[PDB]
Amino acid sequence: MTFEMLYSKIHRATITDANLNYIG
Amino acid sequence: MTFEMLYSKIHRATITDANLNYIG
Amino acid sequence: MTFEMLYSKIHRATITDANLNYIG
Amino acid sequence: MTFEMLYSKIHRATITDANLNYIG
Amino acid sequence: XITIDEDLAKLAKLREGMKVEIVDVNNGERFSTYVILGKKRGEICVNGAAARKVAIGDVVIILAYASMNEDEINAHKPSIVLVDEKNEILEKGLEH
Amino acid sequence: XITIDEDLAKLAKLREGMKVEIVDVNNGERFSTYVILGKKRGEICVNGAAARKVAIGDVVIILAYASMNEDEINAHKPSIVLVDEKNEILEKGLEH
Amino acid sequence: XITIDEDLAKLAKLREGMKVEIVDVNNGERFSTYVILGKKRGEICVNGAAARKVAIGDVVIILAYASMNEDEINAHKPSIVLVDEKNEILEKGLEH
Amino acid sequence: XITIDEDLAKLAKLREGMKVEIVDVNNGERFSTYVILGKKRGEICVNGAAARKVAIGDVVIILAYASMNEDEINAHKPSIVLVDEKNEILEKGLEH
């Protein structure tokens, strides 16, 4: 039996950029 | 082969507080 | 390595009732 | 311990058709 | 949650408490919940918060997924059940 | 995230850091987060971005799922806990 | 559900019935469904309730995830397939 | 997808291609995507359809979950990383 557990987290980081039509 | 099964549940509890900018 | 695979499905069934404040 | 990892992806494909009332 | 006719659930190999995905054809809502075996024939009742995601009379698709390894995948055969407006079985195929 | 009274969490066999599904009966919102053991009695606090998905005073259902094999399923018994408006335990059944 | 050109699916190592995440670049919708191997060349058809989440002609990204252990992760190589407006293969990389 | 400063990702023990949950504090959006190791310092770039779920400058929480058995759970210690407005590390705790 397994359960999904919080492994790690980056708290309150800031989005510095966004790319809707990213390729890759 | 495994299946996600209801393990436990707290039914109809009341939210006593909310913290949008929580830190931790 | 495992993958989530369609195990079974009930196609186009009709909702006969709804209970928002169900208890159980 | 296991983690969901990107196995494969089809990038920027075009939807050629849609069938709301599909049967099967 | 979703109470399903135990006889219908059995045909789809659903177990009580098994997580299932519900997709509403009428309104397009997609959500997850768990199976509750019903005693009423042809009954499909959405309980709890999910009631707000559907309307009585909507057509829905109930799906169950399982985590399989490569060998299980090759030998796997999905249970696809089709029902009528009364939730009576019309077909049960073992292929897409 | 969601801070739950450690005493309440224990009854539902929730572990700190365990992923749980939250469904809000008032507004119908459905989201996932993880459990944080609270020290305040009867406390249920939603932290982070999830705060925007609920209102203080809303009634919610907290669910925990586990991946089981067929044998575990047959021997499995879910912990269903029902509470009152004060998040005090009313019942704890081992069946649906 | 989503019917994908079996020849395209093969290149992405998708199996029929395999759960996949669909993200629509045009409208931002994100949903899950399963793969159905198509017989029509360059075909990508969304079936069922999901049809309400897309429009014919939208650009989408189809993703498949697998649960791996640390060793599998280190040896793992994702299959990234890029196609053109006709869903014809342009590239198939084994890295990001 | 989300390109994360490889140096930041490492601190959170994120692997390239690892599925992660993104929650936007500003707008409340919650979605899943995978990690791409970035080469630019302090960079956090959302790529693909997900770009429509965020705005440059939004504060987000990036979470990674793993499926563990009871023994792994008892010995498990989460990596909680807190950063500043420049995505520079402020703290990295091994507890909640």
- Cβ atoms of H6 and H44 closer than 8 Å: no
Structure token pair of residue G94: 């084994």
- Cβ atoms of F5 and F47 closer than 8 Å: no
Q: Which residues contact E62 (CB under 8 A, 6 or more apart)?
A: C9, C10, C13, E2, E4, E12, E14, E20, E21, E22
Terminal C-alpha separation, chain F: 27
Compute how many other C-beta atoms are within 10 angstroms of the C-beta atom of residue F14: 26
A10 closest CA partner among H81, H3, H36, H85: H81
F80 closest CA partner among F69, F94, F65: F94
Element (H, E) at F47: strand F44-47
D24 closest CA partner among G18, E92, E76, E25: E92
Beta partners for H46? A18
Structure token pair of residue F36: 């944080």
Known active-site residue E34: yes
Round to whole Å and give the CA distance between F72 and E18: 12
Tell how strand A17-19 and strand G19-24 pair up.
Answer: unpaired
Structure token pair of residue E1: 């949650």
Q: Which residues contact A5 (CB under 8 A, 6 or more apart)?
A: F15, F17, F18, F19, F34, H65, H66, H67, H68, H72, H73, H76, H78
Asked if residue H9 belongs to a known ligand binding site, the reply is no
- Cβ atoms of C8 and E80 closer than 8 Å: yes
Question: How was this structure obtained?
Answer: X-ray
Structure token pair of residue E86: 């009364």
- Cβ atoms of E64 and E79 closer than 8 Å: no
- Can you give the resolution of this entry in Å? 2.0
Give the C:F interface size as CB pairs under 8 Å: 5
The type of residue at F28 is G
Q: Which residues contact H19 (CB under 8 A, 6 or more apart)?
A: D3, D4, D5, D6, G65, H32, H33, H34, H64
Tell how strand C3-14 and strand E79-83 pair up.
Answer: parallel
* G96 → closest Cβ in A20, A21, A24: A24
Asked if residue F9 belongs to a known ligand binding site, the reply is no
Round to whole Å and give the CA distance between G42 and E75: 28
- Cβ atoms of H22 and F49 closer than 8 Å: no
Residue E34 CA from chain centroid, whole number: 9
Report all structural domains of chain F as residue ranges with CATH numbers, in order of start.
2-96 (2.40.40.20)
Round to whole Å and give the CA distance between F17 and H80: 11
Any idea what the Cα angle at residue F37 is, between residues F27 and D1, rounded to 5°?
95
State the Cα torsion F64-F67-F71-F72 to the nearest 10°. -30
| Contact: E25, D20; criterion CB under 8 Å | yes
Q: Which CA distances in Å does G83 have to E26, E68, G31?
A: 32, 29, 21
Structure token pair of residue E70: 């490569």
Structure token pair of residue B9: 């549940």
Round to whole Å and give the CA distance between B21 and E96: 48
Sign of torsion, CA E51 E56 E59 E62? positive
SS3 G48: helix
- Cβ atoms of G17 and E76 closer than 8 Å: yes
Round to whole Å and give the CA distance between H71 and H68: 8
Q: Which CA distances in Å does G53 have to E29, E41, F63, F90, H32?
A: 9, 33, 27, 41, 17
Given the residues E19, E21, E26, E34, the one annotated as active site: E34
Q: Which residues contact E69 (CB under 8 A, 6 or more apart)?
A: C1, C2
- Cβ atoms of A8 and H35 closer than 8 Å: no
Give residue for tokens 């599909």: D22
Could you tell me which chain B residue has the CA closest to the CA of F74?
A: B5
Round to whole Å and give the CA distance between F39 and A7: 23
> Which chains share 3+ C-beta pairs under 8 angstroms with D?
A, C, E, G, H
Could you tell me which chain A residue has the CA closest to the CA of D8?
A: A24
Q: Which residues contact G20 (CB under 8 A, 6 or more apart)?
A: G2, G14, G32, G33, G34, G35, G62, G63, G64
Residues for chain C: how many in total? 24
Structure token pair of residue H70: 């009871």
Structure token pair of residue H55: 């705005």
Classify residue F39 by its DSSP letter.
Answer: S
G80 closest CA partner among F94, F84, A23, F87: A23
- Cβ atoms of E67 and E55 closer than 8 Å: no
- Cβ atoms of H41 and H5 closer than 8 Å: yes
Q: Which residues of F are catalytic?
A: 1, 34
* H53 → closest Cβ in G28, G61, G96: G28
- Cβ atoms of E33 and C2 closer than 8 Å: no
G62 closest CA partner among G95, G93, G18: G18
Structure token pair of residue D15: 């939807």
Asked if residue H48 belongs to a known ligand binding site, the reply is yes
Structure token pair of residue F60: 């919610």
| Contact: D9, G79; criterion CB under 8 Å | yes
Phi-psi map region of B23: left, alpha, beta (phi>0 left; psi -120 to 50 alpha): beta
Give residue for tokens 């993200």: G23
F25 near C CB under 8 A: yes
Q: Which CA distances in Å does H75 have to F1, H69, H91?
A: 21, 10, 22
Tell how strand H59-68 and strand A3-14 pair up.
Answer: antiparallel
Q: Which residues contact E94 (CB under 8 A, 6 or more apart)?
A: E77, E78, E79, E80
Phi-psi map region of B18: left, alpha, beta (phi>0 left; psi -120 to 50 alpha): beta
Q: Which CA distances in Å does D2 have to B5, D7, F70?
A: 18, 14, 20
F80 near C CB under 8 A: yes
Residue H11 CA from chain centroid, whole number: 10
SS3 H4: strand
